[PDB]
C-alpha cells in the first residue's frame, strides 16, 4: 500500500512526527488543533495569518519550519475555504491537499488533525474512513511496468490519524486497499492484464483469506453452460477468456449480494474497429471488473458480515480472421438471440451472459458495473456514473451510498418507450439502439436479462479513468459500492 | 385547429354522425359503447369478434359498414391491447389510432366514445382533454408553402367527444390551438419564419385578446438595453433580430410565471459552420420560441387565472463577413463577459440576455425552454426532455406536469463540480464546456444568469421535432408547459 | 483560334511549308503521302523504316530533316497503330499527336496530309472537320491572366489541310472557334468570369453578326418574371446574376432549337459549403453555359439554316449572411414550390426557372446542358456525358451526334419509380433525392418543369473539364452539340 | 509591464524587502547569497538543507519565514539542478520558478540574487537582461476583457535585481515592455483587436516617442499602390484593413532593418473555411504583427542606434458573399499574378504585397515574421521557429541571436527543386505547393517577391502561442528579434 495509517491521541504540540497538519479558513479562523499550536507557539500562527503568509482558501497549503512550542519540526496548514461553505467536498479536498503537499520531500510521518472538524451530515467514523481513503488515493504511484526509470523515493510514508475509533481506521484501510487493487488492475497494460492474469490475480487473493473463494471457468466450461454471447465476443482474441467467480462467506446462510463487472481487458472494437480516436484508453474497459474485484478485496479485508459473490466475464475484444461480425446473430445463455448491430457494443454481450449465469446465486441484489457507453459520458461527464434499475429501493440504496462518500451516481430512466429501439428482424433483440439515448438503451438491453431479479446497472465509462496518456484508473466506483455493502451490513 | 370539437351525450346507437368510434381489448372484451352497439345490432359485433374480424390488439382498427340497429352508417372499432396493461399510453395510442384511421376518406363527423374508458390514476376531465389534443395532433396537415400540389380533401373534420365536462373540452381545445400554433411556427421554412415574422405573428395574436399584450423590441432597443451577447449572435444575418415579450394578466396582482423560449429561426452554426450533417433541421431551432408562444396561446384561450410573461429572443445565426467569430469576448446584458469557444453554441448566448431581461418581471418561476444540445439527445433520446434547476420544488412541479400528460422530462444534475468546465482566461466565462456533460454545462452556463431566480431549464432538442425530411415539429413541450400552468392556476 | 487553317492541294514533295506531316502504320506500311515523299527521296523513308528509326505505333512521331527531293525542310511521320485497328480513335489520336509534336519549336507552317486516310464509316468531310477541331484543340494555350510569366513563342501557327471541301474546312473552323470560346470562358478565373462578364462577352459576340441577337436580363427583370428559385441561389453573392438569351435566326419561320446552359460562375456550395475537397474546380461549373454559348458561336459562324435560342442563367452560388439556407421553400417561375434539402444542389434550381422561361420560344427540341452531379461522374467517368429524356427520338438524335464526332454520351433512365425520391412535406417538390441515383433524380427534378416539352438533359460534370491544377475546360460537349445541329440543318 | 525593476547592490542579509531569493543545487551546495544568509543566520539554511527541507532539484522552491539575522522576513530558496548541468536553461527555469512562487501571496518586493550565478558562455549583462524578461514574462496576467470576474490582488509587484549594470537593466526592461506589448496584442479577442485597432495602438505608441514615426494606410491608399493580393484577402470582412508602417530613426544615415509582420487579426480560412478544428486559435494569426511591433517598442525604449522600419499588413480573413474564392487569379503589387489554390493560405498573400512595399526602404536586411504554416509545426514543434533565406550570413545572424537568448530557430532549405511545386497554368504562380514541404514552399512563395533582397523568413506558427483555451501568446520571437537588433547596434 502507498501509506500506512495509525490512530493518534497526542496533544498536537507534543506529537513526535515530522509534521502536524492543521487547518485555517478563508476568514483566518483556525482549526482547533491549529489553535493548540498557536498557543504553544505564543501566537506565531496568528502573527503569520495577520501578515498574510498563511492562506485559508481552497487549495492553499503553507509549510512552516520550527514553530516554538511544537515538538514536530514542521506544521502544514491547509486552507479549508469559506467556513460557511465547509462540508463533505471541502473536507475531502482539504485532505487530498495535505497529502499532495507531503508526497515528495522530507516528511516521512505526519499527524492529520483535520479529522476533528465537523463535516455536516457525517460522523467521526466517516471522518476517519475518508481520511484514510482520500490520502491513500492521493499517494498512489504506478510503478508495475517501469524498467529503467527511477522514481522519487522521498516523502510521506505514514499518516497518523487524529482519533481513536480503531474500527473506522480498519474499514478505511480495507477500503483503501480495495481502491488500490482496482486502480492497479485498471492501470496494468493490456498485454499484462489479460483474462488469464486477471483470474489468477483474483484467485490468488481469494486463496489467502479463510472464507474467501475463487472459481475460474475457461472457454470449454463456458461453452458447456451455453454462454454463446460472451464467447462470440471473445473468439477473435489469442488471449482466451475466463469467468471469474469470487465468494465471500460473511453472511452465513443469508442470500448474497452479487456484483457483475465488465472485464474487457482490451477493446479494439472488433470488426467495427475504433478508428475515431482514443483506442489507447481501452485498457480501462475492464474497470467494471477491476472495480467489483476491488470491492470484493475491501469487503473481505473489512470482514463484512455479509454474503458477497462477484462475477467477472474477463474477455478480450480483438479484430481477427475469426472474430464475430456485425449482423451476426448469437445465442445468449438465456436462449435469447441477439443481432450484433455493432461489434464494439460488446460489453453488454459479455454482461448479458454473466447476469444470466448469476441467477444461480439467488441474489438479494444484483448490480452490474460497466464502462458501457460514450453516451453516458456525454450525459454525465467524468463527474457522475449513470444508474438504471427497475427497482426504486435498490436504485435509492446505491444513490445514497454514492452521495455519502462523494462518489456520485445519477439515475437515468428505463421507460418502456425506449425498448423498441432494440427491435430486430433477424433475432430476438438488436444489441444497439441508434444515435440517441445510448446509455439508456444499453441499460434496456441488459434489462432483458434481469427481469426476475432485483437488478441495477452502473455505467461507469466517465468515472473510472481519466483521459490522456497521463490519466489513470480512478478506482471509482469502489467507494460507492463498498459503502453500499457497509449499508447492507449495518 | 385541424378538427372541430363538441361534447356529445347521445346514446351510441342513435348518434347521427358518419362514424361511431368504439374500443375492443386483446382478449375480445368490448368497450361499454361497443356493447350498446352490439346489443343494438343483436350480437353482430360479438359475431365479428368470434370469427376474428375485429382485432383488439394495440394499433389495430376495423371499419364496419351499416350494422343493423345503429343510426351511424359506420362503426370503427379500435384495439385497446391487454385490459391488464391499460393506462396512459394505451389510452393515447387508441385515440391517435382512431383519428389516423379516419383522417382521409368518407367520414366527416364521428363520435368518440373512447373517453368513457377508465384510465387508472386519471380523471374524466383528463380523458376529455387528451381526446381533444391527441386527435387534433393526429389530424394536422402542413399546407402553408405547398404551391401546385393538390392535397387530400376527404376525411375527419369534426369530432364529437362523449362526456359532459365543458371546461375539460374547452381546455383541451385551448391546448390543441396552442400546440398547433407551435407546430405551424416550427414547421414554417426559415425564409418565411424569420425573426420579424415570428414577432408579427405573436403580436397579432396578442392584439386580438383583451388582457393579452405584446411588445416587440428591435436591435436599437436591444442595443440600448446592452444585450450585447444576443446581438453578437444576430450580427451576421440579414434577417434582423427581435425581442418578443408577451404578457397575459389573468392573475391580477400576483408575481408572474415567466417562460423564456429560444427563438433561433435558423442555425448555420455561424463561423463554426455545421458541416457534419443535420444543418437542414435547424429550422426547428426556434421551437423553444414556438412552444412558449403556443403555451401563451393556450393560457389566453383557456383564460387561466395567472400572470404569464413569455420572452422570446428571435435571432438568425448566419455565417457572413460580419458574423461574430470564435474567441470573441462579448459583453452580456448582466455585464459578464463571455468567451465564445464556438459560435454554434449560440442558443445560450441569446437566452442569457433574455434571462437577465426577464428579471424585471420579478418572477414566481423563471423557465427557459430551448433546443439546446446534441448532448441532451445523446442523454435522453427523442423520448424525453432534459430538465435542470437549483430549486427542487420547481423541478418537481414540471416533472409532475409532464408525467400527468405523458409529455415527459427527466432531471439532470447542475452540481458545482461541473462549473469549472466553463472557465476562461480571457473572459468571466467560457460559453462551452468541452466533450462531456454537454447538456449539463450548457445548463450550468445559463445558471450564471439566474442565480437570484427560482429558475429551471428545459432542453427540448430531442423532443421538439422529428428527424428526416418528413418529420415535423411535435408541439412538445406545450403539453407539459400548459399542464404545469393549469396546476398553478388550480 | 490558336491556329490558322487553309485547304491545300499541292503535291506533298512540292508543298512550300516548314514541315510535311505524313503517317506510317505499326506494320511499317506508309500513308499515301508518305509514299510520295519516299519516292521523291528515292527510298529514304523506307530505309529509315527498316533500320527502325520511324515508329508506326500509336502515339509515336519522328522529325526528319532535309529529305532529298522534298521542298519542305522537315518531315514529321506520325504513327497510326495497327492498320487492322484503324478508325475514329486512331485517326483523332494521330492528328493530336502531329500538333503536339509541332506545338513548340522551329515549325510555323505545316501541311497535314493525314486527312487522306480512309476512316471506316466516316466521309472525307468529317476527316477535314476533325483535322481542324483536333489540331486547334491541341494548340490551345491559356494566357489571359498570366502577368510577368514569359510564354513560349515558337511553334505551329498555320496548318494547311490536304483536301478540297471548302465547306468542310469552314465548318471545322467554325466549330473550333466555338470550342475555343467555350474553353476560354470555362478556364477564366471566377473573379474575371462573373455573371456580368459572361453576359457582356456573349452580347458582344452576338452584336457583331447580322441575324444574331442578344438580350440580357438583370435581377429586377428576373424578379418581374417570378424566377424566384434562380434568384434564391443568387441572393448571397455580390456578383449579381444575369439571364443571357441569344437568338440566331437562320431558319426563317421554323420552331427553334433551344439550348439551356447552366452558368454557375463559381460554386461555394453555399450554406451547404463544399468542405470535402474539390471546391477549387467550381470555376468549371459554368461550362454548361460556356458550351451552349460555344455552340451558338459555331452555329452563327457556320451560318447554319436553323433558328437557335440559347438561354444561360448566370449566377454565383456564394456563402453569405443573406444566402438562401437549407429547408427554405422557394417559389419557382412555374409556380411550383421547392424544398431546398441542400444549397449545393443549386444548378437545377437555376435551370428549372430558365427552362420555364424557355417555353416561350415554342421549341422543336429543348436541351439543357449542365455540370450537374458528382453522381454522373461516378456513373460515367470523365469519358462520357450522361443523357436523359422522355422522348426517345430526341435522345437518339443526340447519342448519334456524339457518336459521330467521338464526343460521347450515354443514356440513363428517367423512370417513374425514381420520382418518389423527390417527395416533400413542406413543398411541391424536394430538390434532392438522397444517396443513390443522384444523376437520375436530378434529371427527374428537371423533368417536373419540361413535361410539355420535347426535352433532353445532358449532365456534363465529368466531360467538361479535367481534374487538378493543370486540367482545363475541355470544350465538350460543343462537338456533340454542333454535330447535333448540323444534323438538323442537313 | 507586470513588474517594476531596480538594480540593487545591498548585502543579502540587510536588504529591506519582503523576500530574498537565493539558490541551492541538487547536491546541497548553496548560492553565494544563500551562503551570506546562512552565515548571517549562523547555519540555519545548512540545518534545513541537511534535514531535507530545502530541495535543490529543478523546479523546486522553499519559502522560509523569519530566519534569524536576515532583515527580510522571508527567504525563497530556488532549486538549481545538478551544478554539473547548469547553464542557459537551468538559469532561466530558476528565474521563472522564483517569480511563479511569489506571483500570488504576501510578498510585494523581493531581491533576486540569482543573477550572481555564472552561466557558462553568458556575461553578467545577459544574466540581468534575462532576469528581467523571464520574471516579467512569468508575472503576466491577462485582464483586458474580464468583466465581473474579481482577480487576485496580492503578490509580487517589484523585483530588485542584484547587480550593477544599469544598461543591462534598461535593455531588459525595454525588451520586456516589447514582449508585453506583443502578448497583449496577441491575447486580445479579435472583436477588439481588429485591423483598425491594431493600427491605432501602434500609431499611438509611435506618437509618444521623438525619433519614432507611424503612418497608417487604408484600402483606398493600398488600392492606389496596387496591393491587389492583400486586398483580395481583405475583401470579405467588415473590419476593413490597414497598412501599419513604423519608423525609428536612431541610425542617422544608414540603410534600415525592415521587419514585415503578418497581421491576420482573425482567420476563418475564408471560403476554404477551417472546418477541421483549431479555428478558435486564429486570434493568434496576427502574432507576426504583434511581435514585430513588440520589437519596435523594444528598439525605441532601448533607444538603439539603428534605423528600423516595421511594416504590418493588417487584414481579417473572413468568409462572406464578397470573399475571394479559390481559383481566383489576383494581381499582386509586384505585378505577378497568383492563382489562389486555397483561401486559407492567405498569410503569404498579404505578406507578398507588404514585402514589395518594403522595397522602398532599401533595406540592410528584410525579415518577415509570420504564423504561416501548420507544416512548420509538424516540422519543428512549439519549441522552435522555422527560418528560411537565400543569404547565409543573414540566416546565421538570426540563428545566433535566438540561440543567445534561448528563443530558438532552425533553418529549413529553400532549394530550387522545391520551386516547381508552385506552378500554375492560369497565373504566374500558384499560392500553395501541395501536401509535402508545406513550410518550405510557403517560404519559396515569399521568395518570388524578395529576389533582389537580403531577406529572411521566420515561420512562427508553433512558437507564437500555446494550444488550448488557457494558452496565451508567448511573446516569441521578440527575444530573438531584439537580440538580433542589439547585435546590429553593437
Ligand atoms: Ca455580407
Ligand atoms: Zn466497445
Ligand atoms: Zn467495451
Ligand atoms: Zn447552434
Ligand atoms: Zn441553436
Ligand atoms: Zn453545387
Ligand atoms: Zn453547381
Ligand atoms: Zn490561413
Ligand atoms: Zn493565416
Swiss-Prot record, chains A, B, C, D:
Presumably involved in the processing and regular turnover of intracellular proteins. Catalyzes the removal of unsubstituted N-terminal amino acids from various peptides. Mn(2+) 2 binds at residues 262, 267, 285, 346. This is Probable cytosol aminopeptidase. Keywords: Aminopeptidase, Cytoplasm, Hydrolase, Manganese, Metal-binding, Protease. Binds 2 manganese ions per subunit. PANTHER family: CYTOSOL AMINOPEPTIDASE (PTHR11963:SF23), LEUCINE AMINOPEPTIDASE-RELATED (PTHR11963). It is an enzyme of class 3 (hydrolase). PROSITE patterns: CYTOSOL_AP. Transmembrane segments: none annotated. Its EC number is 3.4.11.1, 3.4.11.10. One of its GO terms (cellular component) is cytoplasm. Its cofactor is Mn(2+). GO terms for biological process: proteolysis. Mn(2+) 1 binds at residues 267, 344, 346. It comes from Xanthomonas oryzae pv. oryzae (strain KACC10331 / KXO85). Belongs to the peptidase M17 family. It comes from the Bacteria. Gene3D superfamilies: Leucine Aminopeptidase, subunit E, domain 1, Zn peptidases. One of its GO terms (molecular function) is metalloaminopeptidase activity. It is found in: Cytoplasm. The active site is at residues 274, 348. It catalyses: Release of an N-terminal amino acid, Xaa-|-Yaa-, in which Xaa is preferably Leu, but may be other amino acids including Pro although not Arg or Lys, and Yaa may be Pro. Amino acid amides and methyl esters are also readily hydrolyzed, but rates on arylamides are exceedingly low; Release of an N-terminal amino acid, preferentially leucine, but not glutamic or aspartic acids. Its main location: cytoplasm. Pfam families: Peptidase_M17 (PF00883), Peptidase_M17_N (PF02789). Disulfide bonds: none annotated. InterPro entries: Leucine_aapep/pepB (IPR011356), Macro_dom-like (IPR043472), Peptidase_M17_C (IPR000819), Peptidase_M17_leu_NH2_pept (IPR023042), Peptidase_M17_N (IPR008283).
Amino acid at each position: 500500500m502507498a501509506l500506512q495509517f495509525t490512530l493518534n491521541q497526542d496533544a498536537p504540540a507534543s506529537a513526535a512526527v515530522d509534521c502536524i497538519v492543521v487547518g485555517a479558513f478563508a476568514d483566518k479562523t483556525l482549526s482547533p488543533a491549529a489553535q493548540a499550536l498557536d498557543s504553544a507557539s505564543q501566537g506565531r500562527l496568528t502573527a503569520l495569518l495577520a501578515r498574510g503568509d498563511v492562506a485559508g482558501k481552497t487549495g492553499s497549503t503553507t509549510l512552516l519550519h520550527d514553530l516554538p512550542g511544537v515538538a514536530a519540526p514542521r506544521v502544514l496548514v491547509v486552507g479549508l475555504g469559506d467556513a460557511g461553505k465547509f462540508g463533505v467536498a471541502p473536507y475531502l479536498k482539504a485532505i487530498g491537499d495535505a497529502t499532495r503537499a507531503l508526497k515528495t520531500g522530507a516528511v516521512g510521518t505526519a499527524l492529520l488533525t483535520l479529522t476533528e472538524l465537523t463535516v455536516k451530515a457525517r460522523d467521526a467514523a466517516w471522518n476517519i474512513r475518508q481520511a484514510v481513503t482520500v490520502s491513500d488515493h492521493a499517494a498512489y504511484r504506478y510503478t508495475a511496468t517501469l524498467g529503467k526509470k527511477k522514481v522519487d523515493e522521498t516523502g510521506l510514508t505514514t499518516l497518523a490519524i487524529a482519533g481513536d475509533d480503531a474500527r473506522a481506521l480498519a474499514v478505511g484501510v480495507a477500503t483503501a486497499e480495495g481502491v488500490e487493487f482496482a486502480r492497479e488492475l485498471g492501470n496494468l497494460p493490456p498485454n499484462y492484464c489479460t483474462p488469464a492474469y486477471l483470474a489468477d490475480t483474483a484467485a490468488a487473493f481469494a486463496g489467502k483469506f479463510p472464507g474467501a473463494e475463487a472459481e475460474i471457468l475457461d472457454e470449454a466450461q463456458m461453452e458447456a453452460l451455453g454462454m454463446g454471447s460472451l464467447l462470440s465476443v471473445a473468439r477473435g482474441s489469442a488471449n482466451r477468456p475466463r469467468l471469474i467467480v469470487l465468494k465471500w462467506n460473511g453472511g452465513g446462510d443469508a442470500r448474497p449480494y452479487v456484483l457483475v463487472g465488465k472485464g474487457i481487458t482490451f477493446d479494439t472494437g472488433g470488426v467495427n474497429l475504433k478508428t475515431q480516436g482514443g483506442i489507447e484508453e481501452m485498457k480501462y474497459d475492464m474497470c467494471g471488473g477491476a472495480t467489483v474485484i476491488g470491492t470484493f478485496v475491501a469487503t473481505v479485508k473489512a470482514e463484512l458480515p455479509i454474503n458477497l459473490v462477484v462475477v467477472v466475464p474477463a474477455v478480450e475484444n480483438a479484430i481477427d480472421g475469426n472474430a464475430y461480425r456485425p449482423s451476426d446473430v448469437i445465442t445468449s445463455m438465456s436462449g435469447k438471440t441477439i443481432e450484433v448491430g455493432n461489434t464494439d457494443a460488446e460489453g453488454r454481450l459479455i454482461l448479458c451472459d454473466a447476469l444470466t449465469y448469476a441467477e444461480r446465486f439467488n441474489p438479494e441484489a444484483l448490480v452490474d458495473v460497466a464502462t458501457l457507453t460514450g453516451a453516458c459520458m456525454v450525459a454525465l461527464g467524468h463527474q457522475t456514473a449513470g444508474l438504471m434499475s427497475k427497482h426504486d429501493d435498490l436504485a435509492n440504496e446505491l444513490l445514497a451510498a454514492g452521495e455519502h462518500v462523494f462518489d456520485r451516481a445519477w439515475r437515468l430512466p428505463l421507460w418502456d418507450e425506449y425498448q423498441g429501439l432494440l427491435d430486430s428482424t433477424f433475432a430476438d433483440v438488436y444489441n444497439i439502439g441508434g444515435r440517441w439515448g445510448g446509455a439508456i438503451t444499453a441499460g434496456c438491453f441488459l434489462s432483458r436479462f434481469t427481469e426476475n431479479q432485483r437488478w441495477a446497472h452502473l455505467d461507469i465509462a466517465g468515472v473510472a479513468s481519466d483521459e490522456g496518456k497521463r490519466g489513470m484508473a480512478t478506482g471509482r466506483p469502489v467507494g460507492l459500492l463498498t459503502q453500499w455493502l457497509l449499508d447492507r451490513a449495518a
